[PDB]
RNA sequence: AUCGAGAGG
C-alpha cells in the first residue's frame, strides 16, 4: 500500500543527481557527497580505498535511513589535494584491482578442469 | 487405566492387548477397540467425585517395585513413596486442551505465556479445511506454502496439525541488528 | 508470533545482502531481540530452535511433548555430532561490512505463525468526514469512515498540559460546533430567526 | 613543551580484573621511596611481566585534529615501545609534604604518589606516557 | 478433516457453548457472615426430573 | 524496630526499640493507658485519628499511609500531589471522600458535578434549587464549549 | 499446498527434487535425511522446505468439480 | 474450530481461579483474557 | 459523559506502531497516505504563496499536494475533482487546506491516558510505510511495546493550536517528569546494553570505526580526538567516542560501592566538560533516574540539546552494537555441573529441614508462638525455608554465571531481566502462591488426586523444585498454572479498579489550579493550599540534594563549618585567603562569623526537629553541587593561589541572596512571612553550602566565581517557581494514577484495595491496626 | 599472476566453485558478494496473463512460481531492459514470451513441468530463455499437478531484471565466506562454558592457514588478506560467468561514479 | 440503529 516501489533503489528519479557535492562546514579540505540510489556495497569499498591513500585524512559513509537508498561520504584531505581527485584515484585503483582479479580467476578457471 | 492386584500390584493393561490394538491400527483380524477395553474392564471412566475416592499415578513405571548414578539434567522426580494406587493416568499431557497441546515443551516454560499462545493459535493463519475453494466463507485466509512443524507433540497426530499445519519453520536469529 | 508466546510486528524488511550471514551462507528469515526473552522466561523457544536444527540435519521428527524426559545435553550432543555448535550459537559476519561479528549469534529453525492482525486493514484516517445526525458528531469506526474518540481521560491529559484553545478546537471546531440564537429575556432558544 | 617527569620502576604486581586485554599494574619508584605508581595497561598491545623494570616518562607535548602518522616526517616523540594520552582528573595532597596525581587515559587510570616534586604535572589536560622495554 | 458438530442455520455455521451450572439435588452447608442473625445455613436445591 | 536517634556526640546512631502492634483500635482508652508514649503512638486508621486528635493530624496520617502504599511498590511521588489530594479531602473539615457522597455533594457547580455520577439527579435537584453555575469550572466550559480558564484561558489579552 | 520452487533462506530451486525424493524413500526404504543428502540439499535452509512440506494439492485434487 | 467446539461457559465463590478438581478434565492454561479469564475454559 | 466531555474529533488518525533508531525522538514517522488524507488550513500569505501554488499544482494524490481550497467567499474547491484545478490562481486572504508535511506539529498518544506524558506533541516526518514510527526512548512515557501496539495522532487546525502544541506539549519539554522529579525518557534496550559494552575498558575502537562513528554524530564538530593509545597503534577508547557524543561543559559524579578515585571496579561515573573521566555507562548513568545525565543536560544546557543527545547516543551505540553483535541462547542459561550439584544439595537440605519441622509439629514438641496459630507458625516456617532455598540457588547460579553470559549483560546494563529470572531458569522456581497461600487441598485433605491424603510436604504443597530449563513435573505444572491464572485475574481486576480510582481522582482534583496569588483554589475560590506544594516551586526542577548540617557529629560539624579568628589553629590558614594574615584576631569580623554560626546552629536544631530520621538527601529546588562544579570549570580554579574574597562579602552576600530569592512579591507582612517560611529550608541549604570555611577550603573560590554563583542560584530558583494558571490538581491525580496501574502482587492491606479503602474513607478497614510506642 | 588480487581455486563444478581469494581488502570482498547476488542481471517473468485456470491453485500463486522459474540468462547482455528500449509493452529484443497450455487428459494426475514451456518470441540466435533443467529424469520443476478434466492456459512475458528488485532475477542461492579460521586476528571472541576449542568446531578452512603458536604475541598490525569462498549456481548462468559478471557489475558502478564526477 | 458475540494492545 504505502510501500514505495522496488525500482526506486536502483533507478534515479526526476531531478535527481547520483552525486551531490557540498563542502563540510567547520572543517578544512572536507566535503560531503550524497551518493544517491546506491547502497552499502559501493560506500564501504570507496571508504577502504580512500583510507589507503595517505593524503586523505578522513573518509566515512553513513546511511541516514534503511528505508531510503542513499549514502553520505565525507572526505578530508591534505592541503593542495582536492577530495574529488582522491576519490577518482581510489576508484580507478578499485577498477584496476577488479580487472586484475578477473584476469587471474579466468586463467585459474581455464586451468581448472571439471 | 485400571490398576489391580495380580505378587506385584500391576496395571490391568498388558502388552498383548497393546499388540492387538496396534494390529487394529495396521488394518486401517478381529477389531480391538476402546469400547472393547471398557467392556473388557481394562479401563474405567471417572468423574470428579469418584476421583476423590481413588489414588492415581502419573507413570506406569511407578508401579514397578523399588529396590545412585543418574544424569543431572533429568528433572527432579519425587520418589513416589506411595502404594495402593487405584489407577494410573494414560499420559500426563492429556490434561492439556487442544490449544495447549500445540505448544512445544510447555513443561519448560512459564504457564501464563502458554495461556497467551493458546489464545494466539486461534488467530494464527492456516488452511481451515480442504474444501475451502468449494466453500464460500465470509472471510478466509490460507497460507501460500504451509509447512509442518519441526518439533511435534505426540498429541499432534491426533490433532491433525501435522496434516494441516498453520505455521512455517522459518530460520530465526536472536541478535540486535540495527535496533529495529 | 512463535508457539512459545513471543509476539512481534515487523519493524523493517531487509534484503538478503544486508542481513548477517553465517559461514555456510544461511541467512535468517527473521531477527528477534535477545532482550525480550529474559523477562518473559520462555526457554522452550530456545529449545525448539535447538531441537529443530537437530531434526533438519537428522531427517527425523522432533518430539517437544510435555512431561517427556528429553535432556538438553543430549540434543546438544547430537548437534555437536552434526558439527554445529551445541548451544545453537553460530559464527556470523556483518552483512554491510563483511566483517566477522564479535558475538556469535544463536540462529536456527523455529516454527512461527502468521497472525490474523494485518496492518493495512488497521490503518485509518478521517480528516473531514460524514457525521451522525442526532449527535451531529463524527460517525464511529474505520468501516464507516469514522472519527476517533477524544477520551475524557484524554481531555484531562490536555488540561494537565493547559492548552485550553486546542481543547476547544478538538471539542467544538473538530466536532459538533453549532450556532444558536438565544433570547435574553427567555434565557432559552425560543427565538425564531429569519437570518436573511 | 619539554618532558616533565621521568623515573624507573620495577612492577610490583600485575592483576587482570576480569579483563583479558587489560591488567592493572602496581609499581614503586626505584631508588626512591617517595613515589609509587598504579596504572592500568593493555597487555595485548604490550606485555609486561611481573618484576620487570620499565622506564616511565611524562611529556606535555611532542586540540589539533589527530592525523595518521603516515611518512613520519614528524619526529617520533618516543623511542619507547608504549605511549598513551590522558587527562588528569584530580590532584590531591595524600599527606603533609606529599602530593598525589590522578590521570585518566581514556578511562584507563594512573595514580602517582610522591613528594619528590613540589611543582610539576600541573592541571593541564595534555599528558603523554612513554614506556621503554 | 472436518470433525462436525456445528448446526447450519441460514447458511451460518453455529456452535453451542456448554453452560456450567451447579448440580441440583445437592445439599451444602454454607457459613454466614459475622453480621448475620443466623450462624449457619444448610441449603438443598431440589431438581425435578 | 530500629530507631536512629542522636548520640550525645550528635551522630545519629541506631539502637533497637520495643514497639507494640494491635489488631484492633479504639485509640481513646489506649492513648491514656500508662507505660506508652502518647507522642509516638501511631494508628493505621485515619478516621479514628481524626476523631481522637484533630483534622490536621488526620491529614498527616492520610499522607503517611498513601506514601506507604506508593513505597510498597518501589514507586515515588513528589509530596505535593498526595498532599494536594489530602488537603482537598481535609479542607472541608470532615473526611470528605473521593466518591459520589464526596466532591459531588459539595457546593461546586452542578454541571461539573453532573459529569461524575448521578447526572439527572444533580440536574433535578439543581432545577428545584434554582442553583446557578458559576461556569468557572473546567468541565462546565468543556460542556459549554466556551474556552475554560486553563492557563491559556485564564488571562485576557488586550492590545496597547 | 504444493512443493515450493525455492527455499526462502537458501534460494536454491527445491521443486525439482521432491518427486525424486518421495521415490527415493519408497523404493530404497531409506532415511529421509540420507535422501536429502543424496538430493544435494546439505543446508537446513534448503532442507526445511522438503522435510516440512505438506502436499495439500493432492487432497485439493480429490474434489471432482 | 476444534477449540470453539470444545468450550465451557460458567455464567455469574472464586470461579475464575483454576481448581484442583479441574485436573484431567479441563485444560490448565486455555482461557480467554479480559473479563472472561477462568470463567470460560476448554475441555 | 460520552458526547460532551469526550467526543469524536475530525482530523484523527490511528495505526499500528513500530520504532526506528534513526528517527529523532521529537519526530514521529507519519505514513504518506495519512498525510495525504489529513489537511491543515493555511491562509495564503505572500511568504507561502509560491509554495502553496506549487502544492495545489501537485494535487491531492501526491504529497506535498493539497486537498481543498477555500476562497474569500469560502465556497469549497475540491482538487480531486475540479475543472478549474489547473487554472488555480491564489488570491490574498484565501485559505488553502494542505497536506501534513515534515516538521509540522501534531499530537501523539497511546490509548491509556494515565499521564499527560502519554499525550504530547511530535514533529512530523513523512515516511513511506504503513506503521507510525517513533523513537525507542519515547516508548516509556507512552508505555508502548511494538508487539501489536496501536497509537493515535491528531493534527491542529489553527495557528494558536499549533503554538500551544509546540510551546507546552512538545516532547523535549516533558522530558523531566513533574511527579517523581526525574526525567521520563531514557536510553533503553539495545542502546543500553551496547553502551555498557562499549564503555568497558577492554573494548577498544579502531580508526575506521572511530571515523565512521564520529561522522555518525549529527552535530559532530569534526575535531578528531587524540587516540587514548598511540605508540603501539592508534586505538580510541569507546569511552572517548561516547565522550564525543557528550555535550561540552557537563560534569557528573556518581559514587557506588567502592567508587575510589582509582575506581578499579569502574563503578560510578566521573564526567568533566562533556567527557567521561571514568566509569562504565549503565542504567543509572543514562536512565530515567533522578541525577541522570538526561536530567543535568536538560537542566543546564537546555531541553533541545538533551533531546538531540538521545538521538546522537542512540546512533553511535546502535552502530557499534550492530558491528559487535549480541545474542542470547540456551548455553547462557546452562550452569556448571558442580554448581548444579550444589543446587540439588540446597533443595535436599531444605527438604530435610521441612521434614524435621513437620515431625516437630507432629510430636506437639514445637514451641507455641504468641499471636498466631501453631499451624500458622508451621506454614510461615516452611514458606520461609522454601523461599530462602530458591534465593540461595539463584545466588549460586549468579556466582556460576561467567562474565560472557548475555543475560548477565542485560542485568548489568539494567536493560532487562532480574535475579529472579535467572534463578527460575537455572535453579528452583520455588513454591507457588495461590490467594496469598501455598497450594490448598481442593480434593479432600489432598492437593491433587495422585498424592496421598493429609500430605503437607513441599511437592504436594506446590513447591516447584525443578528449573524451567530442567522441566516441570505435571503436578508442578498444574500448580504453576493456578498461580499464573491468579495473576491474570488480578491484572484484569486491578486494571478496572485503577481505572475507576483514576477517574475519581481526576474529577475530584480537576478544578484545582494555581491562581495568580499562588493560592491553590477550586472553582468556587475556596483555598486548598495557600502556597502550592507548600514551597511554590515546580516539581520538575526539584532534585535530590543532601543537607550537610543535619548529618554528622557535633565535632565534625564544628571542624567543617567553624573558623575562629581568635585562635592559632582555628583561624583560617593564610594560604586559603591572602588577607588571612591581616584578618587574624579581628573582633569586628568575628562578630559576623559568630552570627553566621548561630544561624547554622539554629538551622541544625530546626532540621533535626523536622527529620527524626535525619536523612539529609531530600528534594530541593536548585542543585548547588553542579553549580559549584560549573564555577570551577567556567573560571579555572587554582588550589595553590590564595583566594581574593573578603569574608565580609561572603557573609553579606549570602544574606543578600537570601532576601533576593522571592516566592511571593507582596509588600505586606503576611505575604513576607509566608515567603520567609516558604524559602526557609532552601535558605538553610544555601547557608550549609555557602559556609565561609567551606567556600575558602573545599573549593578555591574567587570573587567573580562567588558573584556568578549567587546570580545563578537566584536565576535557577526563579526558574524553579511554578507558573500561574497551571492545573496542579489534574497533574496530581494523574501522578497518583499511573503508578497504581503498575502495582502487582504478614497481614497488612496494601495495594489497590488499600488505596480504594483510603479514598472511600470506609468506616471499617479490612485490617485495622494500632502501633503503640 | 598480475600484480594485485589473486585467486587460487581448490575445486570447481558446473554448479559450484570453491576458491581462495588472496591479497584483497575485505570491503572489496563484501561489495563483491553483494554484487554477486544483488546486482547482477538475470531474465525472469515479470508479466503473466492466464486464459484458463481449472487448477485448484489460484493464478497469483502460479504467477509467483513462474517468476521463480529458472531461465537461461547467458546472453542477457544482448537483451535490453524493458524500460530501456523504445517498445510499447515488450520489444522482441527486450522480452521473451513464453506459453503454457496443459490438460488433464490422463485419468491419473498430469503434472506440469518446466520442460512444458513454449517460446514464441524470436530467438535472434541468443542463448536466452531456455528452461533450466538439472533433473536426472530431465523433467522440469513442477508448477502444478492437474487431475483429469482440468486445464490451464497462459502467456508469460519475461524481462531483464536485477535481484535487488525481486529475488527471481537472482543467479545464485548462497555463498561461503571464511577468514581468520584460526581466529588469529581475533575479530570475534568465542563464547564458551569450559573451553572455546572443544565447544567451537574446527573448520576445514583452518588447516590451510598455518597453525597458531601460544608463545608468539597477538599481531596488532595484522589485517586479513586471505579469504576462502565458495559459490553455488542455480544454473541460469555458469559459475565462472557469475563471478566475472559480479566483478564487471562492480566495475561498472565505479565507472558510473567516475563519469558522474566528470559531468560535474 | 439496537442487541449480542468474539478480538487487540
Ligand atoms: N486489559 C488490558 C490489557 C493490556 N493493556 C495494556 O497493554 C500493555 C501491554 O502489557 P501486557 O498486556 O502484556 C501486561 P504486562 O504486565 O505489561 O506484561 P508484558 O511485559 O508482556 O507486556 C499493558 O502494559 C497495558 O498497559 C491494557 O491497557 N488493558
Ligand atoms: Mg504491546
Ligand atoms: Zn424571551
Ligand atoms: Zn533453503
Ligand atoms: Zn523492449
- CATH number of the domain at J145, please: 2.170.120.12
Contact list in B for residue C49 (CB cut-off 8 A) is: 172
Dist CA H42 CA D8 (whole Å): 80
Question: Which CATH number is associated with domain A1-114?
Answer: 3.30.1360.10
Written as nine digits, the cell of I168 is 507546552
Query: Which residue is listed with cell 530463455?
Result: J129
Dist CA I390 CA I398 (whole Å): 12
Dist CA I161 CA C162 (whole Å): 12
For residue B177, CA distances in Å to C79, C90, I80, J176 come to 26, 15, 43, 21
DSSP J36: I
Distance from CA of H38 to the nearest CA of I (A): 7
Q: Residue J214: count other Cβ atoms within 10 Å of its Cβ.
A: 4
Mutate to test the pocket of ligand 1, among I495, I497, I499, I502 (most ligand atoms within 8 A of CB): I495
In the Cβ-directed half-sphere of I42, how many Cα atoms lie within 13 Å?
23
Written as nine digits, the cell of C178 is 453549532
Residues in contact with strand K, defined as Cβ under 7 Å from any of its atoms: B 119-120, 122-123; C 7, 117, 132-135, 139; H 32-34, 36, 40; I 111-112, 144-145, 147-150
Give nucleotides in strand K with any atom < 7 A to a protein C-beta.
1, 6-9
Q: How far is the CA of B150 from the centre of ligand 4 (A)?
A: 15
Report how many domains make up chain D.
Answer: 1
Report how many domains make up chain J.
Answer: 2
Q: Residue A81: count other Cβ atoms within 10 Å of its Cβ.
A: 17
Nearest to I443 among H16, H20, H34 (CB): H20
Dist CA I515 CA I506 (whole Å): 19
Q: Nearest nt (C1') to C117 (CA)?
A: K8
Collapsing DSSP states into helix, strand and coil, what is residue H8? strand
* Backbone angles phi and psi of I70, in degrees to 5: -120, 130
Positive or negative, the CA dihedral F40, F45, F51, F55 is positive
Distance of CA J17 to the CA centre of its chain: 13
Residues of C with CB under 8 A from a CB of A: 12, 14, 17-18, 95-98, 120, 123
Dist CA B117 CA B137 (whole Å): 25
Determine contact: I407 vs chain C, CB below 8 A. yes
Kindly state whether residues J146 and J180 are assigned to the same domain: no
Ligand showing the shortest atom-to-Cα distance for residue I110: 1
Amino acid at each position: 500500500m504505502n510501500a514505495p516501489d522496488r525500482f526506486e533503489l536502483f533507478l534515479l528519479g526526476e531531478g535527481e543527481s547520483k552525486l551531490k557535492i557540498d563542502p563540510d562546514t567547520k572543517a578544512p579540505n572536507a566535503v560531503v557527497i550524497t551518493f544517491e540510489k546506491e547502497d552499502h556495497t559501493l560506500g564501504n569499498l570507496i571508504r577502504a580505498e580512500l583510507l589507503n591513500d595517505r593524503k586523505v585524512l578522513f573518509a566515512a559513509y553513513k546511511v541516514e535511513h534503511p528505508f531510503f537508498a542513499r549514502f553520505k561520504l565525507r572526505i578530508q584531505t591534505t592541503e593542495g589535494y582536492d577530495p574529488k581527485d582522491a576519490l577518482k584515484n581510489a576508484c580507478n585503483s578499485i577498477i584496476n584491482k577488479l580487472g586484475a582479479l578477473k584476469t587471474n580467476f579466468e586463467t585459474e578457471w581455464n586451468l581448472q578442469t571439471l | 487405566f485400571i490398576v489391580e492386584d495380580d505378587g506385584h500390584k500391576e496395571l490391568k493393561v498388558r502388552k498383548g492387548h497393546i499388540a492387538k490394538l496396534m494390529a487394529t491400527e495396521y488394518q486401517d483380524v478381529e477389531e480391538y477397540t476402546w469400547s472393547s477395553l471398557l467392556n473388557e474392564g481394562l479401563v474405567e471412566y471417572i468423574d470428579a467425585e469418584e476421583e476423590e475416592s481413588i489414588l492415581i499415578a502419573m507413570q506406569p513405571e511407578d508401579l514397578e517395585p523399588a529396590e545412585l548414578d543418574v544424569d543431572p539434567a533429568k528433572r527432579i522426580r519425587v520418589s513416589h513413596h506411595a502404594t495402593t494406587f487405584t489407577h494410573c493416568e494414560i499420559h500426563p499431557s492429556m490434561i492439556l486442551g487442544v490449544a495447549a497441546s500445540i505448544i512445544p515443551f510447555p513443561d519448560h516454560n512459564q504457564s501464563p505465556r502458554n495461556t497467551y499462545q493458546s489464545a494466539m493459535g486461534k488467530q494464527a493463519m492456516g488452511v481451515f479445511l480442504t474444501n475451502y475453494n468449494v466453500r464460500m466463507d465470509t472471510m478466509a485466509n490460507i497460507l501460500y506454502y504451509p509447512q509442518k512443524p519441526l518439533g511435534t507433540t505426540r498429541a499432534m497426530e491426533y490433532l491433525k496439525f501435522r496434516e494441516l499445519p498453520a505455521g512455517q519453520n522459518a530460520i530465526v536469529a536472536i541478535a540486535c541488528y540495527s535496533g529495529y | 508470533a512463535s508457539r512459545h508466546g513471543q509476539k512481534g510486528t515487523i519493524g523493517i524488511t531487509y534484503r538478503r545482502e544486508d542481513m548477517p550471514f553465517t559461514a555456510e551462507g544461511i541467512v535468517p528469515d527473521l531477527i528477534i531481540n535477545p532482550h525480550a526473552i529474559p523477562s518473559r522466561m520462555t526457554v522452550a523457544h530456545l529449545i525448539e530452535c535447538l531441537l529443530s536444527k537437530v531434526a533438519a540435519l537428522s531427517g527425523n521428527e522432533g518430539d517437544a511433548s510435555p512431561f517427556t524426559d528429553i535432556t538438553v545435553e543430549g540434543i546438544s550432543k547430537l548437534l555437536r555430532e552434526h558439527g554445529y555448535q551445541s548451544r545453537g550459537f553460530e559464527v556470523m559476519y556483518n552483512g554491510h561490512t563483511g566483517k566477522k561479528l564479535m558475538a556469535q549469534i544463536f540462529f536456527g529453525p523455529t516454527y512461527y505463525q502468521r497472525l490474523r492482525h494485518m496492518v493495512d486493514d488497521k490503518i485509518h484516517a478521517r480528516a473531514r468526514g460524514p457525521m451522525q445526525v442526532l449527535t451531529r458528531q463524527p460517525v464511529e469506526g474505520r468501516s464507516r469512515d469514522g472519527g476517533l474518540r477524544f477520551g475524557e481521560m484524554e481531555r484531562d491529559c490536555m488540561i494537565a498540559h493547559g492548552a485550553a484553545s486546542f481543547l476547544k478546537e478538538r471539542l467544538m471546531e473538530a466536532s459538533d460546533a453549532f450556532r444558536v440564537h438565544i433570547c435574553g429575556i427567555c434565557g432559552l432558544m425560543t427565538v425564531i430567526a429569519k437570518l436573511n | 613543551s619539554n618532558t616533565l617527569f621521568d623515573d624507573i620502576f620495577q612492577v610490583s604486581e600485575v592483576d587482570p580484573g576480569r579483563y583479558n586485554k587489560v591488567c592493572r599494574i602496581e609499581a614503586a619508584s626505584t631508588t626512591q621511596d617517595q613515589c609509587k605508581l598504579t596504572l592500568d595497561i593493555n597487555v595485548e598491545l604490550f606485555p609486561v611481566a611481573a618484576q620487570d623494570s620499565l622506564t616511565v616518562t611524562i611529556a606535555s607535548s611532542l586540540t589539533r585534529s589527530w592525523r595518521p602518522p603516515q611518512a613520519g616526517d614528524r619526529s617520533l616523540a618516543d623511542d619507547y615501545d608504549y605511549v598513551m594520552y590522558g587527562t588528569a582528573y584530580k590532584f590531591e595532597e595524600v599527606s603533609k609534604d606529599l602530593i598525589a596525581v590522578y590521570y585518566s587515559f581514556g578511562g584507563l587510570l594512573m595514580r602517582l604518589e610522591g613528594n619528590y616534586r613540589n611543582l610539576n604535572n600541573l592541571k593541564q589536560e595534555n599528558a603523554y606516557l612513554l614506556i621503554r622495554r | 478433516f472436518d470433525m462436525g458438530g456445528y448446526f447450519i442455520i441460514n447458511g451460518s455455521e453455529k456452535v453451542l457453548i456448554a453452560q456450567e451450572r451447579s448440580a441440583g439435588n445437592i445439599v451444602q452447608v454454607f457459613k454466614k457472615a459475622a453480621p448475620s442473625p443466623i450462624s449457619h445455613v444448610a441449603e438443598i436445591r431440589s431438581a425435578l426430573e | 524496630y530500629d530507631r536512629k536517634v542522636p548520640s550525645p556526640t550528635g551522630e545519629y546512631v541506631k539502637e533497637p526499640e520495643w514497639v507494640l502492634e494491635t489488631d484492633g483500635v479504639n485509640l481513646s482508652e489506649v492513648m491514656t493507658v500508662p507505660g506508652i508514649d502518647p507522642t509516638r503512638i501511631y494508628t493505621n486508621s485515619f478516621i479514628d485519628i481524626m476523631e481522637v486528635l484533630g483534622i490536621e493530624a488526620g491529614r498527616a496520617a492520610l499522607y503517611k499511609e498513601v506514601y506507604n502504599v506508593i513505597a510498597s511498590d518501589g514507586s515515588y511521588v513528589n509530596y505535593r500531589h498526595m498532599a494536594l489530594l489530602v488537603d482537598v479531602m481535609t479542607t472541608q473539615g470532615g473526611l470528605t471522600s473521593v466518591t459520589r457522597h464526596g466532591f459531588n455533594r459539595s457546593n461546586t457547580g452542578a454541571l461539573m458535578r453532573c459529569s461524575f455520577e448521578e447526572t439527572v439527579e444533580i440536574l433535578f435537584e439543581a432545577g428545584a434549587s434554582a442553583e446557578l453555575d458559576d461556569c468557572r469550572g473546567v468541565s462546565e466550559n468543556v460542556i459549554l464549549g466556551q474556552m475554560a480558564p486553563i492557563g491559556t484561558g485564564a488571562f485576557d489579552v488586550m492590545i496597547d | 499446498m504444493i512443493v515450493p520452487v525455492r527455499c526462502f533462506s537458501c534460494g536454491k530451486v527445491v521443486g525439482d527434487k521432491w518427486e525424486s525424493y518421495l521415490n527415493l524413500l519408497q523404493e530404497d526404504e531409506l532415511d529421509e535425511g540420507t535422501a536429502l543428502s543424496r538430493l544435494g540439499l546439505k543446508r537446513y535452509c534448503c532442507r526445511r522446505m522438503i522435510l516440512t512440506h505438506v502436499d495439500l494439492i493432492e487432497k485439493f485434487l480429490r474434489y471432482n468439480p | 474450530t476444534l477449540s470453539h467446539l470444545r468450550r465451557t461457559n460458567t455464567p455469574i465463590a472464586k470461579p475464575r481461579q483454576l481448581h484442583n478438581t479441574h485436573w484431567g478434565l479441563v485444560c490448565p492454561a486455555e482461557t480467554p483474557e479480559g473479563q472472561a479469564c477462568g470463567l470460560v475454559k476448554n475441555l | 459523559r460520552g458526547n460532551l466531555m469526550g467526543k469524536r474529533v475530525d482530523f484523527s488518525a490511528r495505526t499500528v506502531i513500530s520504532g526506528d533508531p534513526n528517527l529523532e525522538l521529537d519526530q514521529v514517522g507519519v505514513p504518506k497516505s495519512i498525510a495525504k488524507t489529513l489537511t491543515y488550513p493555511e491562509v495564503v500569505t505572500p511568504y507561502n504563496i509560491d509554495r502553496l501554488t506549487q502544492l495545489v499544482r501537485n494535487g491531492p494524490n501526491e504529497h506535498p499536494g493539497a486537498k481543498y481550497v477555500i476562497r474569500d467567499s469560502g465556497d469549497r474547491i475540491d482538487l480531486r475533482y475540479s475543472k478549474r484545478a489547473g487554472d488555480i490562481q491564489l488570491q490574498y486572504g484565501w485559505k488553502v487546506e494542505r497536506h501534513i508535511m515534515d516538521n509540522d506539529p501534531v499530537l501523539f498518544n497511546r490509548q491509556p491516558s494515565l499521564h499527560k506524558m502519554s499525550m504530547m506533541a511530535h514533529r512530523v516526518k513523512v515516511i513511506p510505510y504503513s506503521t507510525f514510527r517513533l523513537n525507542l526512548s519515547v516508548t516509556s512515557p507512552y508505555n508502548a511495546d511494538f508487539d501489536g501496539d496501536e497509537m493515535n495522532l491528531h493534527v491542529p487546525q489553527s495557528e494558536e493550536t499549533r503554538a500551544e502544541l509546540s510551546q507546552l506539549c512538545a516532547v523535549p519539554l516533558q522530558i523531566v517528569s513533574p511527579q517523581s522529579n526525574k526525567p521520563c525518557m531514557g536510553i533503553v534496550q539495545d542502546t543500553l546494553c551496547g553502551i555498557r559494552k562499549l564503555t568497558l575498558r577492554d573494548t577498544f575502537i579502531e580508526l575506521d570505526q572511530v571515523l565512521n562513528m564520529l561522522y555518525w554524530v549529527p552535530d559532530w564538530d569534526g575535531v578528531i580526538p587524540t587516540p587514548a593509545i598511540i605508540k603501539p597503534k592508534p586505538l580510541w577508547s569507546g569511552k572517548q567516542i561516547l565522550s564525543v557524543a557528550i555535550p561540552n561543559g557537563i560534569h557528573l559524579q556518581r559514587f557506588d560501592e567502592g567508587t575510589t578515585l582509582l575506581s578499579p571496579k569502574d563503578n560510578g561515573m566521573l564526567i568533566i566538560d562533556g567527557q567521561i573521566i571514568f566509569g562504565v555507562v549503565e542504567k543509572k548513568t543514562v536512565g530515567s533516574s533522578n541525577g541522570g545525565l538526561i536530567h543535568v543536560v536538560t537542566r543546564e544546557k537546555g531541553p533541545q540539546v538533551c533531546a538531540k543527545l538521545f538521538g546522537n547516543i542512540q546512533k553511535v551505540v546502535n552502530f557499534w552494537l550492530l558491528h559487535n553483535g549480541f545474542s542470547t541462547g540456551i548455553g547462557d542459561t546452562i550452569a556448571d555441573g558442580p554448581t548444579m550439584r550444589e543446587i540439588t544439595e540446597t533443595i535436599a537440605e531444605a527438604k530435610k529441614k521441612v521434614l524435621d519441622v513437620t515431625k516437630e509439629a507432629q510430636a506437639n514438641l514445637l514451641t507455641a508462638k504468641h499471636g498466631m496459630t501453631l499451624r500458622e507458625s508451621f506454614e510461615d516456617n516452611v514458606v520461609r525455608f522454601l523461599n530462602e532455598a530458591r534465593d540461595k540457588a539463584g545466588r549460586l547460579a549468579e556466582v556460576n554465571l561467567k562474565d560472557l553470559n548475555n543475560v548477565k549483560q542485560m542485568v548489568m546494563a539494567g536493560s532487562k531481566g532480574s535475579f529472579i529470572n535467572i534463578a527460575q531458569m537455572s535453579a528452583c522456581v520455588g513454591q507457588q502462591s495461590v490467594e496469598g497461600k501455598r497450594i490448598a487441598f481442593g480434593f479432600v485433605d489432598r492437593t491433587l488426586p495422585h498424592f496421598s491424603k493429609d500430605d503437607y510436604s513441599p511437592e504436594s504443597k506446590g513447591f516447584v523444585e525443578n528449573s524451567y530449563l530442567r522441566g516441570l513435573t505435571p503436578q508442578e505444572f498444574f500448580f504453576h498454572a493456578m498461580g499464573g491464572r491468579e495473576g491474570l485475574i488480578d491484572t484484569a481486576v486491578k486494571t478496572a479498579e485503577t481505572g475507576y480510582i483514576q477517574r475519581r481522582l481526576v474529577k475530584a482534583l480537576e478544578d484545582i489550579m494555581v491562581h495568580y496569588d499562588n493560592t491553590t483554589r477550586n472553582s468556587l475560590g475556596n483555598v486548598i493550599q495557600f502556597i502550592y506544594g507548600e514551597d511554590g516551586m515546580d516539581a520538575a526542577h526539584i532534585e535530590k540534594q543532601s543537607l550537610d548540617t543535619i548529618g554528622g557529629s557535633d565535632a565534625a560539624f564544628e571542624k567543617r563549618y567553624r573558623v575562629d579568628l581568635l585562635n592559632t589553629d582555628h583561624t583560617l590558614d593564610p594560604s586559603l585567603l591572602e588577607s588571612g594574615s591581616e584578618i587574624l584576631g579581628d573582633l569586628k569580623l568575628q562578630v559576623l562569623l559568630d552570627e553566621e554560626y548561630k544561624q547554622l546552629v539554629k538551622d541544625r536544631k530546626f532540621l533535626r526537629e523536622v527529620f527524626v530520621d535525619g536523612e539529609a538527601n531530600w528534594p530541593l529546588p536548585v542543585n548547588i553541587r553542579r553549580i559549584i562544579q560549573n564555577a570551577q570549570q567556567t573560571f579555572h580554579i587554582d588550589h595553590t593561589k590564595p583566594s581574593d574574597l573578603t569574608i565580609k562579602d561572603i557573609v553579606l552576600g549570602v544574606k543578600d541572596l537570601q532576601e533576593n530569592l522571592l516566592v511571593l512579591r507582596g509588600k505586606n507582612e503576611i505575604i513576607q512571612n509566608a515567603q520567609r517560611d516558604a524559602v526557609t529550608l532552601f535558605c538553610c541549604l544555601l547557608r550549609s553550602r555557602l559556609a565561609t570555611r567551606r567556600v575558602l577550603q573545599e573549593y578555591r573560590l574567587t570573587k567573580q566565581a562567588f558573584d556568578w554563583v549567587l546570580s545563578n542560584i537566584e536565576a535557577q530558583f526563579l526558574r524553579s517557581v511554578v507558573h500561574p494558571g497551571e492545573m496542579v490538581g489534574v497533574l496530581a491525580a494523574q501522578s497518583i494514577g499511573e503508578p497504581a496501574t503498575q502495582m502487582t502482587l504478614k497481614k497488612v492491606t496494601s495495594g489497590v484495595p488499600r488505596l480504594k479503602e483510603i479514598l472511600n474513607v470506609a468506616k471499617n478497614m479490612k485490617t485495622p491496626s494500632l502501633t503503640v510506642y | 599472476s598480475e600484480e594485485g588480487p589473486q585467486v587460487k581455486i581448490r575445486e570447481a563444478s558446473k554448479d559450484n566453485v570453491d576458491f581462495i581469494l588472496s591479497n584483497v581488502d575485505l570491503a572489496m570482498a563484501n561489495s563483491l558478494r553483494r554484487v554477486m547476488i544483488a546486482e547482477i542481471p538475470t531474465l525472469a517473468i515479470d508479466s503473466v496473463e492466464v486464459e484458463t485456470n481449472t487448477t485448484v491453485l489460484a493464478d497469483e500463486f502460479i504467477a509467483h512460481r513462474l517468476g521463480l522459474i529458472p531461465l537461461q540468462s547467458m546472453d542477457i547482455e544482448q537483451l535490453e531492459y524493458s524500460r530501456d528500449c523504445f517498445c510499447e509493452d515488450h520489444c522482441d529484443k527486450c522480452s521473451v514470451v513464453l506459453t503454457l497450455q496443459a490438460f488433464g487428459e490422463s485419468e491419473s494426475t498430469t503434472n506440469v513441468y518446466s520442460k512444458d514451456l513454449v517460446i514464441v518470441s524470436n530467438l535472434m540466435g541468443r542463448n536466452i530463455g531456455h528452461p533450466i533443467i538439472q533433473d536426472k529424469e530431465g523433467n522440469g520443476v513442477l508448477i502444478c499437478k492437474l487431475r483429469k478434466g482440468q486445464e490451464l492456459k497462459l502467456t508469460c512475458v519475461a524481462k531483464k531484471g536485477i535481484a535487488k528488485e525481486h529475488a527471481k532475477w537472482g543467479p545464485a542461492a548462497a555463498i561461503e565466506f571464511e577468514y581468520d579460521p584460526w581466529n588469529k586476528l581475533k575479530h570475534t571472541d568465542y563464547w564458551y562454558e569450559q573451553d572455546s576449542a572443544k565447544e567451537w568446531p574446527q573448520s576445514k578452512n583452518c588447516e590451510y592457514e598455518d597453525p597458531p603458536n601460544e608463545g608468539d604475541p597477538f599481531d596488532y598490525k595484522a589485517q586479513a588478506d586471505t579469504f576462502y569462498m565458495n559459490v553455488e549456481s542455480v544454473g541460469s548462468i555458469p559459475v565462472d560467468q557469475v563471478v566475472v559478471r559480479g566483478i564487471d557489475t562492480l566495475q561498472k558502478k565505479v565507472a558510473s561514479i567516475l563519469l558522474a564526477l566528470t559531468q560535474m
